[PDB]
C-alpha cells in the first residue's frame, strides 16, 4: 500500500508539504524494508 500511494503521487516536488509527505513515505519504506530484512535474515 505504501508503494501504491508513493507511485500515485504526481511528478511535481515544488510544494513544501508535498515534499514532506514524500520524505515521510520514503522513511516509512526504509524502516519497513529494514523490519522485513531483520525478520527474513535469521529464519
Amino acid at each position: 500500500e505504501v508503494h501504491k500511494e508513493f507511485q500515485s503521487l504526481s511528478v511535481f516536488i515544488d510544494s513544501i508539504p508535498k515534499k514532506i509527505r514524500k520524505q515521510r513515505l520514503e522513511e516509512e519504506m526504509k524502516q519497513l524494508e529494514h523490519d522485513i530484512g531483520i525478520i527474513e535474515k535469521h529464519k
Binding site: 531483520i38 525478520i39 535469521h42 529464519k43
Partner: peptide
Amino acid sequence: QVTIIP
C-alpha cells in the same frame, strides 16, 4: 543461527 529481538 536463530533469531532474538527485544
